[PDB]
């Protein structure tokens, strides 16, 4: 009778109970390749094994491995029986229909849940801040999206994707630290550099200015203690790393940066709602956590929009879990209870019941 919320991401699964204000479990979205290995316990047995990520750029690409993630979620992380709980799953913006159907089939036929639902991640994030209209920038470990939403409805023709997110930033930071004279190359070293990224990076308001400053000050230099006790120094790499989001050319990508995808997304929407979107730019996901990202987005969008436009970037402190929080609120709503797809409805209509959405 307590509903479960499972927010399955490229890097992390966030899972818990509807009604809670935070996920009780957050663990890596990895499988080792129940003798087979998942989650935190698959990292240290790699191994006669290497790590596999079943979700790539927000999309489930291996269903066998995803069943193991989900098994691990129910039995090892939450310690519940799936037969006893309605289960809210999250999906990427523009997740293919057949993918949605397969998630539904697995929940009912493999796991035997009494009911379930698939929600769009960006929409939940928006709901978490009590909004039903706005443009979400959702940036995680594997993918980033702009999703404009109007009165609860995602507008799919205006959704902008970038296959550039947290992991690319980590990997880029590895390279430029290595160019500094360090050596960060192994899988373990990638985790360390991820931790450095999460603790010391930031987005410059003016990148070219901040690069000039870097050659002068050391008020930008910061240090970091490695597990073996070597203390390393990091300088202009602090802000060159997340600068990649605004300049994907830093990692050899020729896509629009996130300010430009935000603007593009708004321009693909009906002229009459564009001011609503400009005034409700909402950020979510771990890769939006950089100090300074909101100010920089404000400035970049201002440079692109009409001089009379009112622009507001909303970046809540909780935004690293706002998808999950959104799902927890949603699944608890009285008006949502009629929306669950029950097992009987699945029996009656099959996987394609997800598109009618009961």
């Amino acid at each position: 009778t307590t509903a479960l919320v499972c927010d399955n991401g490229s890097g992390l699964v966030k899972a818990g109970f509807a009604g809670d204000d935070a996920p009780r479990a957050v663990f890596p979205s990895i499988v080792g390749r129940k003798d087979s290995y998942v989650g935190d316990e698959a990292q240290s047995k790699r191994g006669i094994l290497t790590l596999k990520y079943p979700i790539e750029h927000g999309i489930i690409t291996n269903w066998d491995d995803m069943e193991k993630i989900w098994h691990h979620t129910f039995y090892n992380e939450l310690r519940v029986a799936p037969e006893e709980h309605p289960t809210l799953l999250t999906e990427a913006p523009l997740n293919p229909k057949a993918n949605r159907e397969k998630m539904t089939q697995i929940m009912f036929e493999t796991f035997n849940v009494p009911a379930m639902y698939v929600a769009i991640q960006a929409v939940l994030s928006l709901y978490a801040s009590g909004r039903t209209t706005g443009i979400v920038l959702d940036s995680g470990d594997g993918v980033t999206h702009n999703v404009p939403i109007y009165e609860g409805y995602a507008l799919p023709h205006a959704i902008m994707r970038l296959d550039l997110a947290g992991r690319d930033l980590t990997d880029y930071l590895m390279k430029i630290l290595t160019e500094r004279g360090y050596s960060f190359v192994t899988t373990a070293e990638r985790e360390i550099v991820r931790d450095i990224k999460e603790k010391l990076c930031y987005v410059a308001l003016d990148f070219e200015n901040e690069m000039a400053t870097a050659a002068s000050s050391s008020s930008l230099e910061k240090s970091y203690e490695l597990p073996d006790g070597q203390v390393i120094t990091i300088g202009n790499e602090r802000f060159r790393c997340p600068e990649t989001l605004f300049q994907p050319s830093f990692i050899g990508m020729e896509s629009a940066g996130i300010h430009e995808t935000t603007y593009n997304s708004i321009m693909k929407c009906d002229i009459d709602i564009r001011k609503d979107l400009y005034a409700n730019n909402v950020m979510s996901g771990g890769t939006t956590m950089y100090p300074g990202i909101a100010d920089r987005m404000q400035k970049e969008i201002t440079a692109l929009a009409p001089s009379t436009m009112k622009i507001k970037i909303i970046a809540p402190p909780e935004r690293k879990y706002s998808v999950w929080i959104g799902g927890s609120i949603l699944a608890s709503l009285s008006t949502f209870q009629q929306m669950w797809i029950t097992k009987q409805e699945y029996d009656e209509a099959g996987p394609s019941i997800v598109h009618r959405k009961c």
Binding site: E56, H57, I59, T61, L94, N95, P96, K97, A98, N99, M160, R161, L162, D163, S249, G252, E254, S255, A256, E260, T261, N264, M267, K268
Partner: protein, 414 residues
Amino acid sequence: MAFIERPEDFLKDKENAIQWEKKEAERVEKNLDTLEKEALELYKKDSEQISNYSQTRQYFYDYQIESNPREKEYKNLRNAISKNKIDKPINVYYFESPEKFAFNKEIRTENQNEISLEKFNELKETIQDKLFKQDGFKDVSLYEPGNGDEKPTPLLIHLKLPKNTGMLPYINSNDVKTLIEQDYSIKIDKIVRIVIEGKQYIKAEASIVNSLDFKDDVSKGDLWGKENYSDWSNKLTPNELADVNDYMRGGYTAINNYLISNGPLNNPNPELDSKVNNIENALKLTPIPSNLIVYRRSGPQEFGLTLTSPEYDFNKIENIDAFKEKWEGKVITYPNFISTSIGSVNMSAFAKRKIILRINIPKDSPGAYLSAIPGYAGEYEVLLNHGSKFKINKVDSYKDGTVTKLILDATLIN
């Protein structure tokens, strides 16, 4: 004296051509609303720029295209031309710069009267076995220029236009003119050396090849794709349907890096070999049902460059020269499967890519509109078979903001 039905080619009958086209202008003026007339009048005042806009308008973001005020003129003049379709073929005449057909040197100087034999064979070797894509507004003549006519280049195009070709005869000051919007590729069937008023000219006997080119009209394109490939994932044997989806959902990287590395010869692999075979025959299932133009914004490394290569800076003219010298007129092979789109518009994911491959695909080539599958990553995508070969007919350049980008007019030769 004139027959009471026009010929298909007025030849040197300048006098009947002009009088006939003068009456046609007068008839056609009765079918234009004032927006069309206004568009015509604007064209007489500002020809070069309106024509230039009509050649490259389709390469920008859908929202940039739509916000551009030059669209009104483009759309209304296009409509004026489209109204007036000829009920049988007609041949036309106009001069063209040789670099238009990728011959990037003078045939002869305007002071020379004669054209060398080697010049002639070099032109012929450059411009044959080639389909050259044409776009935009052009003024053409219904008669062959003669003594006293303006002759700005040594290259005369003598082009046959088929039935249902839109043509707009009109008057400008004291000249009778004829306006078309080019929307086809031309085949130079034969060149011959003629003389007019004491100078040698090349005369190109040319005809047209039609192809579906959706340009920025991705909705029409997508309608066309869906209504041609709806059945398509029904007709796949289950073994093919998996490998396709595997490819589609990130498998392409493994499969294509395998092909590019000559895996099947070097370190062969039977599993994904059957995958290449299955995807291929899946592409043979509903072959491309019309001649079709598709677009691909290419990564610089498809052409031996990187983001940081100084020769990827096409704002510098010599880098464009160098690129032409390397690639124009060459055939090019993709050991991998390759993705293309029905749409010409720029997109967020490739917004900064500088090299656009604009490909002619003959009817019945292997390929499929993969974007007839609901929710596929590729935007309006057409997938072409591994080992495809493309002849690069011609390289053009245009300005996207301050950045110079290239359009490679190319043909799938299998």
